[PDB]
């Protein structure tokens, strides 16, 4: 994997150094329906006029981005998305901006969020959870090799494609850093303790997040939950985890090594790096090459009735995207 990553880094750097810009325009698409929403924007299913292809358009109101102080974060998201390339990372097809908004046009992943399937079904069996987990492990290995930290892992951001494989979306908090950073960001249930304690953290927070994700997928509920964020932080800081009766011995051990407050012990960060995870008993049945190559039998393949079908997504109240005859925040988003 050393040779692969070496070549992949070179490919990344060229794009990180000279990012693409203005590859489309609003009038080239017909906006159809909202697919999902987040704190900073909304994602819509759209159809490209000239090609007839469908895409998922993320729309960001520039003024809201400023108010919520996400300027630098939004610039991070777009610069990173246009430079990466991995089988489990959603593809940025186009990007552009207008007087009022910022746009990121991605490939439409019709299977819906893992979140919806997870809550409906209740929980995923271990082999089922392991299939998704393997893909995230590989994605983090790739991202971390480029000095990138994801920072927002959660079922809501993991889409299922037509083959049953995962496609990671939302790089709103993704950042390229060598060393440590201090931003208090992410989603409450997934924050590593270092983040909450404001001590400064590194890539290891992504590995702790993986632990939370695996736990949520296998249990059906997160390891630390409560009605209010602050109550959740107290549980995370205390650190004591409780496991369902159906969790295998191997799963509980892997988890104790991921949901580990001690950085000198948490898997993924140690000397052997990612191999401590890959070689773990819980993953003994995993063929890492086959997973990467997508040759493994997907345990679940979503129902899809042609292009433009959004049946795997909830419905959302539609909102008219505003326009203005005056350019807003021009200098702030110059590089977008």
């Amino acid at each position: 994997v050393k040779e692969f990553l070496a070549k992949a880094k070179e490919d990344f750097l060229k794009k990180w150094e000279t990012p693409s810009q203005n590859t489309a325009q609003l009038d080239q698409f017909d906006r159809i329906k909202t697919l999902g929403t987040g704190s900073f924007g909304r994602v819509m299913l759209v159809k490209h006029k000239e090609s007839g292809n469908h895409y998922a358009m993320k729309i960001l109101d520039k003024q809201k981005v400023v108010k919520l102080k996400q300027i630098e974060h939004t610039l991070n998201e777009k610069r990173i998305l246009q430079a990466v390339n991995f089988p489990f990372l959603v593809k940025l097809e186009f990007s552009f901006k207008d007087n009022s908004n910022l746009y990121m046009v991605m490939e439409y992943v019709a299977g819906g969020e893992m979140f919806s399937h997870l809550r409906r079904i209740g929980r995923f069996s271990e082999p089922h959870a392991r299939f998704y987990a393997a893909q995230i492990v590989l994605t983090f290995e790739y991202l971390h090799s480029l000095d990138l930290i994801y920072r927002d892992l959660k079922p809501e951001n993991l889409l299922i494609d037509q083959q049953g494989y995962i496609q990671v979306t939302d790089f709103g908090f993704a950042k390229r850093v060598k060393g440590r950073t201090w931003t208090l960001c992410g989603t409450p249930e997934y924050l590593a303790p270092e983040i909450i304690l404001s001590k400064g953290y590194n890539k290891a927070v992504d590995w702790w997040a993986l632990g939370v994700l695996i736990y949520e997928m296998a249990a059906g509920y997160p390891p630390f939950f409560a009605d209010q964020p602050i109550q959740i932080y107290e549980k995370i800081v205390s650190g004591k985890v409780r496991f369902p009766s159906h969790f295998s011995s191997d799963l509980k051990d892997l988890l104790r090594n991921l949901l580990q407050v001690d950085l000198t012990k948490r898997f993924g960060n140690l000397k052997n790096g990612v191999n401590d995870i890959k070689n773990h008993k819980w993953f003994a049945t995993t063929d890492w090459i086959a997973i990467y190559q997508r040759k493994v039998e997907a345990p679940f393949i979503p129902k899809f009735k042609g292009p433009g079908d959004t049946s795997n997504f909830d419905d959302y109240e539609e909102e008219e995207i505003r326009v203005s005859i005056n350019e807003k925040c021009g200098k702030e988003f110059t590089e977008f």
Binding site: S39, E156, E189, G220, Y221, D227
Partner: peptide
């Protein structure tokens, strides 16, 4: 049960990223 306490809680729906 832990499941019942979760299901009866206010955080069973889509969770948004933290925003100041």
């Amino acid at each position: 049960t832990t499941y019942a306490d979760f299901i009866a809680s206010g955080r069973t729906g889509r969770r948004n990223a933290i925003h100041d």
